[PDB]
Ligand binder design. Structure first.
Ligand SMILES: Cc1cn([C@H]2C[C@H](O)[C@@H](COP(=O)(O)O)O2)c(=O)[nH]c1=O
Ligand SMILES: [Mn+2]
Ligand SMILES: [Mn+2]
Length: 178
């Protein structure tokens, strides 16, 4: 699994993921499924941000904490949007709302409710993806065009397929907890 991550994700993504885990006191070489989940999530976030107009999205995930909240607070101050309690993943300039992205090894609906329950904030939009082609977004508003979405969904299947061809999928798939 460690070798899989290092081969399938780019070095920038792998460095951010390694850093995030170490910040929690976890070793990417040991909690290898979490390493892969974090990389996959980061990758999805970057793809989503590249999926509309140039400049449509501000990326929040992947920034250090200080720069993250600088972006968030600056956005809230300039748009008067409500200040979220937790850092979201992106801001959508066109819709004027924060986005929370989830990638799940379980099922799209359960993860959606878990995110909803954490968020509280009425405004932050939630969009969940799975590795089996499903998606789920607040008020069935999927934000991006279906071709952008299809590229994310396809990339996640392609990850799943690679993990399975290395016999990594079964363990990965059962590693996410409520
Ligand atoms: C906020 C947070 C996320 N994560 C992981 C869970 C997900 O795989 C990934 C992204 O989280 P997010 O979906 O809340 O943006 O980071 C942690 O391990 N610890 C944390 O404190
Ligand atoms: Mn995040
Ligand atoms: Mn997220």
């Amino acid at each position: 699994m460690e070798d899989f991550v290092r081969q399938c994700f780019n070095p920038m993504i792998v460095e951010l993921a390694e850093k995030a885990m170490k910040e929690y006191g976890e070793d990417p070489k040991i909690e290898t499924n979490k390493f892969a989940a974090i990389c996959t999530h980061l990758e999805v976030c970057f793809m989503y941000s590249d999926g509309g107009s140039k400049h449509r999205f501000e990326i929040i995930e992947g920034r250090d904490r200080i720069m993250a909240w600088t972006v968030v607070n600056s956005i809230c101050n300039t748009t008067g949007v409500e200040k979220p309690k937790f850092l979201p993943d992106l801001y959508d300039y066109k819709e004027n709302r924060f986005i929370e992205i989830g990638v799940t090894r379980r099922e799209v609906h359960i993860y959606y409710l878990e995110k909803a329950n954490k968020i509280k904030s009425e405004k932050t939009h939630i969009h969940i993806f799975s590795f089996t082609g499903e998606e789920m977004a607040t008020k069935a508003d999927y934000t991006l065009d279906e071709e952008s979405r299809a590229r994310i969904k396809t990339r996640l299947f392609t990850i799943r397929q690679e993990m399975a061809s290395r016999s990594l999928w079964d363990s990965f798939r059962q590693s996410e907890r409520a």
